[PDB]
C-alpha cells in the first residue's frame, strides 16, 4: 500500500509530463468560461458526495441506536434496521437519508443542459466554423497570390438570425435556475440541521406492539450530520462564488469582444443580442487554429504602435500559408 | 502477493526502460522550476493523506472509547459512534477529524492557479511561440539561401505590453499566499496538538439523559494524532523549503536570462517587469526544439573562445535545416 | 485463484517473448551503471516495505496486548489502540512504528537527484548529442562523396567548461551521502532492536486514572520486529555492496574511456575532471545508434590486427549511409 | 463468478487465436535453450510461492495454538501472535516462516545474471549482428547484379577476442551456482522438516512471567509444512532436471554448430572456446530473418542430394532480394 | 452488480461484433485439429478447478470438524487447522487436499509439448512456408507474363528428411501419454472416493497428549468431495472423447490429403511417414492466403466437371496477382 | 459508489456515441438471424446464472439449518456444511446444488457448434466470397471500360456440391437438439421443484452416530429455490420463443432469397437444398460491401417502376468504381 502510493504519486508523472491538449484536434464548441463553470458545477457535488462517505471519515453505520442490554446481537441489528427504515416515513430525517441522492440529482440536472447544447447545437456550429475558417484561408491565399464576398454576405444573413443566441440564453438560464435552486436547498438544509441529530424510533409495531419487554422508544443518533452540514456549506459557498460568472457568461451585448474581421479588412478583397455577435465570439475563441489570422494580427499589432511603414511590402513578403 | 510484488518491482521495468519524454511533442508552456514547484506543492499533501491512513500504520478505528463492562457490543459501538459524532460539535477535536479534508482543500487551492493559467494563458502563448519559431526558421532558411523584420517589430510591440507578466505575477502571488496560509495552519495544528489526545464524550443526552446506569462521562482516545503531527511537520518543512523558490520564480527582472536573439544577430537579415522579458524567458526555455538556433549557438560558442576565423565561410558551409 | 496463477505465470509470456527495448527510440541520457545503481537504490526499499507487510508473513495486528480476562472485546480493543497510540510518544518504539515511513523517505530522497538531473540536465545534453551525431553523419557522407571543422572546434570550447561535470558530481555526491545515511540508520536500527520487542503501556490515564479495576501496566508485543530486522539487514548488505559502484561512477578521470573520434581521424576531413571527458563518455555510451561509426570501428578493428591493406580502397568501397 | 470463468476460459480465446510472435521485430539476443532455462528457473519459484498461499489450500492462519479455555478471544489472539513472533528468534521454525522469502530471493538471484547480460552485452551484440546481416545482404545483392571482404576480415579479428564468450561463461556459471545452491537448500529443508511440525511457545515473559494462571507452555502447529515440503520437492526435481541443460548451454566447443558462411562460400565474392564460435552460434540462431540466406540454403540442400546441375544458371535466375 | 451484469452481457457485444481473426496476420504454424485438441486439453482442467472453488458452490471451509461443546472458538479453530494439517501425512485424504494441484500439474504437462514445438519448430517451418509461397507466387507471375524448378527440387530434398515428422510424432505421443495418465488418475480417484468422505483426526499429540479433557478422536467431513468427483468424471469423459482425435492427428500416412501442387501442374513451367507429406499438409492448411492458388483451384474445379474448354485462353485471361 | 455510478451511467457515453461497427472490416461469415439466435442462446444462461447469485437477491448461505440451541457456533457451522455435503449424495437436492453448473454446461454446449463452424468452415467460405467479389468488381470494371465467364462456371460447379449446406444443416440440428434438451430439462426442474424446498439431513454418522445428545434429524431450507425456478421459467420461455427461428434458419429451399446475379445480368459480359443456394444467401448477406452492385441495384430499381429509358446511356455514364 505504501509502495503503491509512492509509485503512483512520486515516481509516476503527476503534473510534470502529462500533456492535456498535446496537438489538440477538432474544434472548440464551448467557451472557456462556460466550460469551466459547467465543469465546476457538475464535479463539485460528485466530489462532495465521494468525500462524505470516504472510509477516512466514516466510523460505523449511518445511524447508531442504543438498544437495551437484554437484546441480543440480532435484535439490536433489527432495531437499527427498523429505525433506519422509519427514518424515511417518520422532514430532516429523510433529508439526511437522501442527501447524496439530492446532490446527485442536482449534478445530473446541471449536466443536462450542456448535453442538450452539445447534441442539438454543436454540429451546426462546428460545420459553420469550419466553413468560415476554410473560406477565410482560401481568400487569404488567393489575395496573397494576386498581390504577389461569400463570407461577408453569409455573416450579413446570420445577423438577421436569433436561434443560436436564443439556445445559448436558455442554456444559461437553465443553469442559473438550477444553481439557484441548489443554493436555496442547501441553505434550507443548513438551517434545518443546526438544531440536533438525535431522533427516537418506535419499534413497538405489529405483533410485538402489545409486548411489554420492548422499550417504548429507542434513541438513535445520525452520524454524518456534521460532515453533511460542512460539505453543504462548502457547496453553497462555491455556488455563490460561481453565481456572477453565469451572469457574465450570458451578458453578450456588454462583453469585451474584439472583431476578428478587423485585421482581415486590411486585405483589399475583404470589404448585441444577436446570432452574429455570438458567432464572432465563437470565432475569436476558436481563432487560435488559424495561421493567416496570426499574420494579420501581427501586422495589426505592428501598425497599432504607430510605425510609418507601408503595408503593401509586408503583404507581398508573405506567401501561401497552407 | 509476494510474487505480484516481485513481478511489479523486479521483473517489470521500474526506472530502467520507461521513457518519460521519448520524442516529446507539443510546446513547453510552463517553466521547469515553476512546474516542479507546482507538482511538489500539489502532490505532497495528497501523498501525506494517503500515507496517514495506510493499513500499515492504522490499527483500529479513528477513535477508541472505554465503554463500561456491562455494555454489550452494540451499546459500545453506539458509544463510539456517538463520541465520534460529538467530536465535531464538541477546536482541536474537529481539526483532528477533518485534517485530511483540510489537506485536500489546500491541495485543490494550490492546483487551481496553474489550471487557471493553463486555461486562460496557454493557447495564446503557445500560438505566439509557434509563430516566432517558424518565422525564425524561415528567416534563417532565406538568409542561408541568399548568402549561399516582422519578428523584431512584433517583439517591439510586445515590449509595450504587460498582460502576460501581470497574469504570471498574480499566479505566483496566489501560490505563495496559499503556501503561506498552509504553513500557518500547519504550525497552529502542531502547536495545538502537542498537549494531549484524550477527550471525554458525554452520552447522557436525550431520553437516556436521566438514566443512572450510563456513566456520566466516557473517555476516548484519538489514535492518529501522532501520525498527523509528524506528517504536518514534514509538510511544513517541505513548504518552508520551497518558499524561496516561488520568490526566485517571480523574480523576473533580476533573473539570469540570456537573450536568444543575440546569436541571431550574426545573421545580416536580423537587426525587467515586462512582457518582452517573460516571452524571452519562455523562448529560452522552449528553444531546445529549434535546430537553426543550435547552429547559431554553436557558432557563438566557437567565437566566444577567441578564434580568429571569419564567420562568412562557416555560414556559407551550412545549408537549409528544414 | 490457482487457474489465474497458471495463466499469468505459465501460459502468458513472462521472460520469453516480452521485448524490453524493441526498436528503442530517443536517446540514452543516463549511463548504464548509473541507471542500474539508481534503480537498485530506489526499488530496494519499496520492495522491502512491500514484503514486510505481505499477507503471507503477517498474522494479526501490528501489536498484541494481553488484556485482563474481565475486559470485554471493546475494552481490549481500546487497550490495543491506546498502547499503539502511546508507542509513539512513549526511541525504539516509534522507530518500529515508522520503519516503513523511514524507508519510503529514503527511497524518495534517493529518487530525487535523478529527477533533478533529468529535469535540469537531460534536454541540453540530448540536443548536444543529437547535433553532434547528425554533424558526424553529414561529415562522413560528404567525405565519402568527395573520395568517391565545426565539431572539433565545438568540442574544444566544451573542453573549457565544467557545468555538466559539476552537476554530475553533485548528483553522485548526493546519492552517496543519502546511501551512507541510510546505511548508518539501518545499522543503528539493527543494533537497537536486537534486545527485545516487548513494552508495557500504561492505560490508567484520564478519568480512569484513579480507577482500581484496571491493571497498573499492560504488556504488549511487537509482531514484525524480526521481519523488520531481517529486511533492514538485507537492505544494509545491498547498500554496502553498491557503495563502491557510486565511487567507480563518479571516478571520471581514471575511467577506462576510449575516444570515439579516434576512428573518425581516419577520415581526411576530420583533424580528466572536465566537461569534454563526460561528453565523450556519453557519446561512447550512446554511439550504438550511429551507423557510420560502425563502419569506422570495423575498419579500425581490421587494421588493429596488422593487415597490410590500404584504407583508401576500403573507404571508396563504402557509400552513403543515410 | 461462474459466468466470468466461462467468459475468460471458453468464449475468450485462450490458446486458439493469440499470436505470440506475429511479425516479430527486433533481434533475438538470447538463445532459445538459454531463454527457456532462464524462464523456467525464474518463474518456477514464483509459481510455487503463489500456489503455496492460494485460498484453495490454506484453511486458517499460518500457525494454530491451543490456548486454555479460560482465555478470551483477545488473549488467545495475543498467544497466537506471540508464538508467531517467537517462531523467529526461538532453525526449522524461522525457515518455515521465511520459506516464501527464501524462494523469492532465489528467484531474484536467478533473474539477476540475465538482466546483467541484457544490460551490458545486448546492445553491442545486436549492433554487430545488424551490421553483419546488412553487409551480407548488400554483398549478395551486388554479386547477383554482377553475375546477372569486410565481413571476413572482421570475423578474423573477432576470432582473436574472448570478451563475449567470457561474459557468456560467467553468466552460465552464476546461473549454475545459484541453481546448485537452491538445490542444496531445498534438500536441507526437506530433510529438516520431515520430523514434525509442532512446537511449544513460552508466553510467560515480561510482567506476566511470575503469574501462575498462564500455562507454562503453549503447543502450536505449523499448518503449511506439508504443502511447503511438497512444493520444495517439486522445485528440487525441476532444478535437477534442468541441471544438465546449463551444462549443454555453456558447452560451446562441442556444440553441434553448422557454419552459416558455408552456403555463402558459393558466391564468388565471398572467400571452440572463442568469440567467433559464439558469434556464429548467434548468427545461426538469428539467421531466420535473412532472406538471401534462405536462397543459399535452398541451393545447398538441392546440391547436397547429388544432382548434376550447374549452379551458375540458378544463381543468375535469382535477382535482388531487398 | 445487477447493472454491471446487464452492461457486460447485454449492452456490450458478446458474440455479435467481436472479430476473432479480422485480417489475420502471420502464418498458421499449427493445424486446426491439433490446435483445438491442445486448447481443450489445456483449458478443461483450468476451467474445472475454477468451477470447483466458485463461491456459488462452496459453503464454508474445506473441512468441517465437530469439536466438543466445551471448546471455545479458538480451540475449535485449532482443531480444524490441526486436522487439515494431518489430512496430508495421515491416500484419499492427501489426494482430496491436492486435487487442484494435480489438475494444474496435468494442465501444465499438457501445455508443455505445444510450447516445445512452438519454440523449437515454428520458426524454421514458418520461414520454409513463406519461401515456398513467395516462390510459387513469383513462378505464377512470370509464367503468366510469358504466356501473356527450385521448389520442385527443394521438395525432392525434403522428401529424404524426417526431422519435422519425428518431432510432430513425439509431440503427439507425449500429448497422448499425458492424456492417458490423466485418465488413469481420474478413474483411480473416482474409484477411491466413492466410499465415504469422513475421517477421524487425532488431536492428542504433544504436550496435550496425556490430557484427559480432549476427546480421543475428532470426526471431520470433507466438503467438496462430491463436486470433485463430478468434475473428475466430466474431465475423464472429455479426455476419453478427445482420445481418438490425437490418433487421427498423428495418422499422417492415411490422412485424406490433397496435393496442392496438382493445380500448379497446369502451369507449363511447373513439372506417408515423411517430411514431405507433413509439409504438404501444412501448405494445404495454410494455402488460404495464396491468391494465385485460388485461381488455379477455380480452374481445376471448372475442369473437374468435364467442360470442353481450352485452358490456354483462361490462363491468358488472368494477369499478375501481386 | 454513488459518484462512480453517475460517471459510468450518465457522464460517460452509454448508448449515444459508442460506435458498434464504425468502418467494419473483414467479411460477415455468419448470417444476421443465426448470429442473433446464437448470441441469445449463449448469453441467456450466463446472464441468468449471474443474476441468480447477485448480492442484491442473496441474503445468506445456500442452505440454512436449524441447529439446536445447545450447539455452539462451530458445531452449527459443521451441521450446515455436513447437510450441504449430503445434499449431493442424499434427485431435487443435487439438481438445486448444481443448477448453475447445468446452465453453464448448456451454454458451453450451445457455444460449441458455432465455434466448430468458425474453425472448420469460415476460412474457405471467406476466401471464396473474397474471390467472387473481386472477380465481379474486375468484370464490372472491364465491361465499363469496353462499353465506354469464370464466376458463372465456378458457381455451376458449386451447384453440384453439398459440403457447405450439409455442415450448415448439422450445425442447425445440433443447436436445435441442444435447445430442445435444455427446454426439457428446465420443464422437468420446474415440475420437480414446485412441491417444497425443505429437507432433513442426518448428522448422526461416524463416531458420533451412537451419541444421544445430537438430534436424530436436522431440518434445512434451500434459499434460492424460488429465484432458480423463476429464472428457469424465463429461460424456458425465451428458448420456446427462439425455437421457430432455428427452423426458419435451416429452411433454405423455402427462404425468400433474391439472386444477386440478376442485376449483373444487365452487363453484356455476364451470361433449394444446395451449396449454390447457401452461397447465394451468403453473397446477399455480404453484398453491402460491393459498390458496383449498388449501381446495378439502383439501375434495377429504376427500371422496375417501368420508365422507358435506355440502359446503354446509363451504363456509359458510370465509370470505374475501384
UniProtKB/TrEMBL annotation, chains A, B, C, D, E, F:
Transmembrane segments: 32-54, 98-117, 165-190, 230-252
Record InterPro entries: Innexin, Pannexin
The keyword Ion transport is annotated on this UniProt entry: yes
GO biological process assignments: monoatomic cation transport; monoatomic ion transmembrane transport; positive regulation of interleukin-1 production
Membrane topology value: Multi-pass membrane protein
Localization (cell): Cell membrane; Endoplasmic reticulum membrane
GO molecular-function terms, A-Z: channel activity
Glycosylation sites noted in the Swiss-Prot or TrEMBL record: 210
Keywords, comma-separated and alphabetical: Cell membrane, Endoplasmic reticulum, Glycoprotein, Ion channel, Ion transport, Membrane, Transmembrane, Transmembrane helix, Transport
Gene Ontology cellular-component terms listed: endoplasmic reticulum membrane; gap junction; plasma membrane
Family: Belongs to the pannexin family.
Role summary: Structural component of the gap junctions and the hemichannels.
Name of the featured protein: Pannexin
Gene (name only): panx1
